[PDB]
């Protein structure tokens, strides 16, 4: 469907996976002699994980600048995404309730619990619903697909009642996630090249596109 399709990649891409456009010139989903991490289940799971994380990242990288330009948030906040303490050489914010290492330890424990339980459910489907977890195991059963667990919390409003609706929503999620991944890559590249925020780059380009682009930002 897309550009770069091949007869070899079409042997294993029959539209079963969500967002299958037959774009695989590097042949990473061939089930013939597959192992380790280069296999269809892990690759699709990693793509949906990167998709959701990049969606949150793109929104979180462009939200404080847009909210600051709109006057909703004060002037103490509204800093660039790479100047919020992420990279201390690029700038750090000292307005938090604690230093970034304490918050990092909190993130270590929190992310370890979430990610390790997620991994254990991927390795053993449904194993996160038997052991006692303060009664929360009733919603950690998931389904056969580790990428789409569902349940009372992960599917709060029980959307996608029909299989077609669920397929449509899955395709929308993967496309928005790919767009967000490209946006995050663009955010990093613009931060290294221009040295400013992404919304600032968008504004500067909208003012005069001929004098504001990658060709004029070289030197």
């Amino acid at each position: 469907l897309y550009v770069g399709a091949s007869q070899s990649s079409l042997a294993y891409l029959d539209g079963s996976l969500p967002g299958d456009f037959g774009f695989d010139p590097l042949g990473l989903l061939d089930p013939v002699n597959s192992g380790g991490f280069i296999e269809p289940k892990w690759l699709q799971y990693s793509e949906v994980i990167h998709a959701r994380w990049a969606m949150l990242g793109a929104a979180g990288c462009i939200a404080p600048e847009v909210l600051g330009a709109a006057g909703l948030i004060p002037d103490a906040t509204n800093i660039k995404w790479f100047e919020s303490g992420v990279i201390p050489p690029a700038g750090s914010y000292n307005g938090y309730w604690a230093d970034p290492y304490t918050i990092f330890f909190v993130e270590i424990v929190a992310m370890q619990f979430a990610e390790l339980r997620r991994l254990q459910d991927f390795r053993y489907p449904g194993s996160m619903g038997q052991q006692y977890f303060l009664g929360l195991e009733a919603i950690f059963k998931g389904s056969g697909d580790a990428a789409y667990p569902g349940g009372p919390f992960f599917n709060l409003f029980n959307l996608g009642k029909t299989e077609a609706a669920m397929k449509e929503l899955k395709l929308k999620e993967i496309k928005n996630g790919r767009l967000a991944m490209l946006a995050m890559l663009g955010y990093g590249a613009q931060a290294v090249m221009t040295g400013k925020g992404p919304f600032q780059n968008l504004v500067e380009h909208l003012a005069d596109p001929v004098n504001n682009n990658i060709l004029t930002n070289f030197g």
């Binding site: 061939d30 013939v32 002699n33 192992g35 380790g36």
Partner: protein
Amino acid sequence: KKVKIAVDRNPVETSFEKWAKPGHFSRTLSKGPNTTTWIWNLHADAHDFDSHTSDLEEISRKVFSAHFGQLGIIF
């Protein structure tokens, strides 16, 4: 005609069972020691991968892992 990533999953099991059996790689040394010569043979045919088996795939895999161990030593 197609260049891809061909692989086999879990061919050899990670265990210490063979660590207690010296000379398991060769059919001649698998019997055990009877003379001191055997001991020297145990060290002379250790890396001789094309003598343990005639399968080229096994030799290539052993070579790959030997290269990784060597780079670990260098690091």
